[PDB]
Write a protein that binds this ligand. Structure first.
Ligand SMILES: O=P(O)(O)OC[C@H]1O[C@](O)(COP(=O)(O)O)[C@@H](O)[C@@H]1O
Ligand SMILES: O=P(O)(O)OC[C@H]1O[C@](O)(COP(=O)(O)O)[C@@H](O)[C@@H]1O
Ligand SMILES: O=P(O)(O)OC[C@H]1O[C@](O)(COP(=O)(O)O)[C@@H](O)[C@@H]1O
Ligand SMILES: O=P(O)(O)OC[C@H]1O[C@](O)(COP(=O)(O)O)[C@@H](O)[C@@H]1O
Lengths: 416, 416, 416, 416
């Protein structure tokens, strides 16, 4: 008794929000992937932080390394609501990175982390969209009596090449850890699945420092948490597994756990339109596990009449507050804040990131419009293949990405 | 030279947010009128607070006469963003009036007001809707060498009986002030209008005090700013006027100034639907003069298909965050937060306050639904007048008010 | 397993901060006793709030019965650091009691309390000084399968008449409860002590409601938690006890638990000087259980030379920020913020509340100076008892209270 | 009229808080000079920011470039109190500097600054300790009708080699600007003084961008605001002067203006002990122009008895809140937060930065003890010259600097 409460308090989170998401290719080109928008108003680092709040861990470390001014701004504006006097804060560590990343990146700020005097460090990732409690994870880490606890999940074998694959024992003890294998070794029972890592580790902190120095001296290591550190603990035999279904926060218990690594642009589009469906897989209307963001004041989403006095028919949409839609059939889309949309437009299966200004008679289909574009009048997008692969970036699955640069290069005056 | 910015600093606002809005019969009988919702996200009082921010007066006094626990909460959550040590704050002054009109609310808390060490005090009576720049008014107050400055606007003579009417000379100096007359006098040039007050007085700091005590040691006055004090000052000739067009904040200078005495319920429906029309009179999309409110983290305005799979139509509407609409043609309406409209409904020119849950097959027309009011399936409002006057409260013009306690009569269990 | 941290989440605290501290004759006759200063920077209520934070109960209800505008302000400035949308907040509930004891303050705001959707409600009566962990108490409450848990501590029999005395069996189940007796009963093993209550009850959510209505529809009860409800529950046998040593937060486990019923003025001087001594009983330097307050930006405690150029001595004292001392030997004293002690003074065992301006050549001994009290030059306090009983209020033990209104009698103009 | 108010609103501040203060030599070695402590609780960037608040410019740009994690932390914790919805914020730009500094450093973030849409940019410095209003400066900049306005002051000729020297005209128009000359050209009237620049410029913003690009293309420039930019505007003839005495905020008007460039270690010590004097030159007890910092909750400054039962005599000291002093004569010192000082110590003319733990019988004289040292027991400092120049850094004027590294190298176990 009195364990699940006293475990977060003695613990501190380290969010590794220094990813780039190179497979998004342009969407994270001007922003760190953790600062990528998602789900109407939120960002991808609003999940990994919220999970720390609602699990009790109010001491967070946001390691913003690569191309992070908007991430600093978001963490400053929305998440600076802490009274440090009671040992709660989201400490915004800049990395000043020297390749040689994420676990050297916890090592550069090793002299700041120590001064928290924490017993259990949570090594998170801030580029994933999950919904988990770590208070149920730390209990499971301390009961087993391990030094490190990896959060693993069974994923398909065709995409398990991109995650850290592992094999566990009866008591969830790591025997064999391999990382990004070309041939993912399946689980013993199911051949179509592999028990892969999620990037959510938990160390007992006095080990962790004690480990990161042995690797800091190491000149032959990659200095990654999944390539030369956990494959070292695994040989030591002190690494245990924590099956993710035990701690995933679900609204209904009859569904598979929801952990989406955004990763690429088509998966971003899928995982951001699944909220616009009838019954979403991610329940954002939850009140026993809410997710916080930088709540900005916008006016209500305005729906006015078109230029001819007609009406706008919005089906399976996710129009957010602040927009102004004039007529314009809007299907299966997700309109972020301030997305003006003028008349006679047909928007189907689109993700319009904030402040996108769509001109008259525009027919957008299966696309992702980047922030603060000015789409001209009469521009069809997504109802052509060879012509949408030449101006904008069309992916292998049909998805289009419209950036504020691709429109400038065509000459459509994005200055506004 | 340097007087335009040193006048707000030496001034303090006194919002007399202790109205009860008696003409708002059942809408305000649970909450004080300053705490009434208007325009999706805002409340009435926000205006009279935001006009104090943008006009530089960052020291406010909210003189909340009781019936309000829901505006103490609103102030404490939204407007508790001040550093009280750099001389900027929103002092929440409980009125604690004797179980004794407006002035006797400033008198009881007159020992708390002196300690602000102010120079010009801005009496507001801020349970109205408008956009004003009070610094303009302070400049006009000091330029004239006045002791009280009343903000006067010409209004129609058929309504001037509700307000204090005044008669000024060439210098905008008050000649004749009559408070709430049965036969309002007209202007010397326009006989159809009347130069009425607006509740916005600006007094000298060291005079009001010397004037309240002299009026507080009396046993004959009603202790009201309009009936007793302003006539007392007019008798001395130290009362000057400020035409409100000079200090009104208009996005378009080709319109007429926007001051709504919201409290009628027939005018609380027209001013709330005024933001749903094609071109509104009150611009909420103005960035040089933004209005702030308590901005909680709501998910986007979700639109989905009906139970059969059809689409939803919207024409000249507002849909704030948290709303969920399924099919159900909407017209001319305004939906506040978390308004789960269900399928096959027909909403026309309605104000749906927060957390209103409209049931299936509900035809709502010219109505004002109080907050958290769970309308049942099949209910029909606004069609046959005698029915709606038999169950709900219907004003003389046609507007209907629906309250939580109003349906429990009819048996429709609420318990949201 | 996972019960230690899921009990605070499903619980809400109700601080009955509506005491008037009648034994604090003139110290609280302007401010409610929860808003009284103690220990330099803190107020009385902070304790009962901070114990709710550190114990995980981040949903509080401050049931402030009126005479308090200076604790509404304190809550709104200091403790308005919550994100109210992640289920953590300090609801400031005005009591608005009929011009009807403690329970009838929870009854009027019983329609606001249901909407929290709580499971265990923590009645506190938080106008005391202590350090407790309520989560320990909730664990002990659910382990016993109880319906109300009373926090009992043994106190001396010569004072137990002030509190409710109880008699428990081996299971800590209440046998006999007598509220504020004239002849308190003693314990079966120690005849010099009495197992008294502490005002800290923990009720089931769905029972209290069902118990308040049953007691609110009566016209015979006093509507007090000690006189009516707890005896009513004892009669059913569903009242269990919680020894307070089990849940007290002690830096040293070799001391006795620290609970001060501050209100006597002779005990508000001893408990405030207890922090000036060599080793205090209440540790304010504890980092695993910090106590928060409103922390304004004050400059350091400046010490300077006298008018002649001599030095100042301090022995066993506290000097908070903003203070300014010039020479003037200080002993055993406690100086609150902005206390400009001037030269040639001799302060011995005194409590100087904020903004006290002591004049030149002032000899202060065994006194409690109210806040902003400008003592004049040459004043002498605590030397000759009959004089201090002729001008100020002097308790039977020797302690003196000095108030702003107390000096105006004598002619010493204050107007700081 | 209506100018001094509307000028800050249309303006934005750019604080160049990227300095190192190379002449402090060790004090800024681990912190950006703007984050250097000063005056008990404050930092050097708490002035340059506060001057922006109390002058109306609530839009600030903090260009943190070099070795800034604590500066980010301070700006996040203390100065993140802004409601961006009303166009007020302290935007914390990281520079990611590529030598080639300060004016290329405003150029890297040229795409963020534009999006404010500001009319007048204030180019401040965050390494100086002044107290000025820029609302009186912008009026003086717009009346003259200049494109740039330099804040200049007459300083001595023996230290005018380290500032930008200039010569003005009758209408304060720059004729000749030279920068860090080896022979400072004096003023025409006074030969012992030179009219030097302060680093506080004001541009009309549409010029500024229009200028920074012409210099961004320039491959032969130093990219500094005082070496190849203002010496260019001066040739253009569009640079005017704003004598600092016109806008310096003084408590009393009979004193010379107070602008201290900390710069070196002896000037740091002088300018930080001048607050501990009887009548300081910098009035920090001002209420019409306060200075904000990260107000942390500490207990009052405790003064206890020594180990033998003696008393501590503090003369002309500035003991801050949080300390614990035991006996120990303390003269002319400045004790920052949490500075424990044990018994029998003699502290004369010292600056003890936060958390310094001084051991028993320590005799410190004319020194600056860096943050979080652990000074051992019996260690004399400053009462020897040849022995204080060999362990610690002794300056040419006698001042000593004790760092947490110089003590480790002696072997005194700074880990704590
Ligand atoms: O190429 P540009 O001109 O920077 O435009 C790209 C847009 O993306 C942004 O960087 C948005 O990034 P965020 O993800 O931080 O919102 C804007 O600054 C800018 O308008
Ligand atoms: O009096 P009833 O019938 O219980 O209804 C009360 C409802 O009205 C309200 O008092 C309206 O108050 P708010 O302005 O705070 O929303 C709500 O608190 C509650 O939902
Ligand atoms: O009633 P008096 O004589 O005017 O004295 C009032 C003083 O006491 C107080 O009411 C004490 O209240 P606080 O607890 O808010 O400090 C002060 O507001 C004021 O300084
Ligand atoms: O050499 P160390 O171990 O970093 O110690 C130097 C000290 O200075 C600090 O960097 C303080 O810097 P700040 O100026 O930001 O307070 C501490 O982190 C540290 O204790």
């Amino acid at each position: 008794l009195m364990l699940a409460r006293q475990l977060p308090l003695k613990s501190v989170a380290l969010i590794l929000a220094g990813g780039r998401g190179t497979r998004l290719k342009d969407l994270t080109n001007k922003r760190a992937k953790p600062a990528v928008h998602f789900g109407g108003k939120f960002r991808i680092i609003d999940f990994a932080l919220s999970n720390c709040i609602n699990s009790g861990i109010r001491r967070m470390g946001v390691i913003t390394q690569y191309q992070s001014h908007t991430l600093v701004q978001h963490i400053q504006r929305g998440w600076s609501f802490f009274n440090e006097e009671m040992n709660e804060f989201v400490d915004l560590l800049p990395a000043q990175q020297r390749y040689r990343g994420t676990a050297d990146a916890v090592t550069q700020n090793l002299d700041i982390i120590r001064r928290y005097k924490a017993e259990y460090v949570v090594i998170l990732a801030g580029d994933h969209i999950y919904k988990q409690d770590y208070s149920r994870m730390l209990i499971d880490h301390v009961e087993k009596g391990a030094r490190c606890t990896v959060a693993c999940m069974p994923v398909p074998i065709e995409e398990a090449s991109a995650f850290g694959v592992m094999a566990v024992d009866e008591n969830d003890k790591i025997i064999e850890f391999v990382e990004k294998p070309a041939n993912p070794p399946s689980m013993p029972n199911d051949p179509s699945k592999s028990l892969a890592s999620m990037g959510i580790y938990v160390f007992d902190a006095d080990y962790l420092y004690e480990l990161l120095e042995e690797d800091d001296r190491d000149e032959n290591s990659s200095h990654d948490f999944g390539k030369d550190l956990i494959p070292k603990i695994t040989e030591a035999g002190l690494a245990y597994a924590h099956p993710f279904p035990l701690s995933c926060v679900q609204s209904d218990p009859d569904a598979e756990p929801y952990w989406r690594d955004v990763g690429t642009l088509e998966a971003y589009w899928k995982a951001n339109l699944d909220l616009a469906s009838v019954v979403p897989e991610l329940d954002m209307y939850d009140r026993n596990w809410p997710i916080r963001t930088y709540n900005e004041s916008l006016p209500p989403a305005k729906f006015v009449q078109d230029r001819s006095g007609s009406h706008g028919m919005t089906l399976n949409s996710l129009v957010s507050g602040g927009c102004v839609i004039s007529g314009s059939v809007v299907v299966q889309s997700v309109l972020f804040s301030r997305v003006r949309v003028n008349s006679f437009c047909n928007i189907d299966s689109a993700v319009l990131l904030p402040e996108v200004w769509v001109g008259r008679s525009c027919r957008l289909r299966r696309c992702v419009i980047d922030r603060a574009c000015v789409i001209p009048e009469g521009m069809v997008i997504g109802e052509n293949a060879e012509e949408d692969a030449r101006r904008f970036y069309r992916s292998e699955e049909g998805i289009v990405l419209v950036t504020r640069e691709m429109l400038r290069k065509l000459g459509h005056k994005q200055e506004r």
